Symmetry: D2
Subunit: 91 residues, 4 copies
Amino acid sequence: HGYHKQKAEHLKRLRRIEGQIRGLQRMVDEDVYCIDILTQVSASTKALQSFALQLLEEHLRHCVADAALKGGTEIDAKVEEATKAIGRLLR
Amino acid sequence: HGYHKQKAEHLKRLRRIEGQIRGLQRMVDEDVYCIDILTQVSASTKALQSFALQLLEEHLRHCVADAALKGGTEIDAKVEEATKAIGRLLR
Amino acid sequence: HGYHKQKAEHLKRLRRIEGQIRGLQRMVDEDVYCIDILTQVSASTKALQSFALQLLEEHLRHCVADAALKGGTEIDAKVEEATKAIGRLLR
Amino acid sequence: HGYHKQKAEHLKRLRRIEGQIRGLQRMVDEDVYCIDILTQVSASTKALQSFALQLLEEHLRHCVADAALKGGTEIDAKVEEATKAIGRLLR
């Protein structure tokens, strides 16, 4: 249940993030001080970044590694794709 | 309805972000290719960043400006706080 | 010497960053392990971000505050500009 | 000269970044408007990020791939390291 382990934890992290977004809506609805709203926006963006890093790690480990066993063209295509994805996350 | 305008649009943006997070859960549930999941994580983090910038703009315009009219100590405290908040968003 | 204090420290921070970039060139010239090069790239990007936050703080405190005393149009223009600049730093 | 190609371009990019940092020092020395200084800070941080992505791509392609051919423990160690490095760049 290695897949099943990672999946259940991904879904738990995402459920937590989804509640944070509902929290933000409540904050706006109540006119909570903007700095406090920003603090929660940052906590949410950070939880998403942390989720992205776990996905990246699993991707590199399985997908990108498996391409190395197939050949050069395959690994180049996978690394090019992962690198574009990391570039998007960087912004 | 200037407050009411900004509020309604903040809530619309947040409702959109909340659906994106439910989208991510569906992607994980269906084992969508990880790069595609990352693309959506990045779109969500970016929508949150864009929301944060709008809040910051409104904060600077009203709160931080109003402190300038009160005095030096007041503006220093507000600018110190906004700058810490921006530092958190930067990460 | 409040201006003179901040100026001298800005220049010291920048001189330190400039040496870090020369360090990176030496690392590449010697074929240092790429992860170690990345660690130094990150330290440099972070020192630049930290410099950017100090500038932002001083800008908000003087420029953006002084605009509040002038009027609404003036503060809106200053806040719009600062917010675009922060958006650029965010990426 | 594939190594030699990448090396020469890495060094050219870094020489360009080093001049940008000297540019920043001139800006501060002349008391250039802070927003303009920020614009250059952002251009420099972005050039460094772009350099980091090229290094990452080359690292993944050679180092991380070569570890896949060695075995599981080797690839896990390499992916763990690359992922920590990407986490540092993300901030």
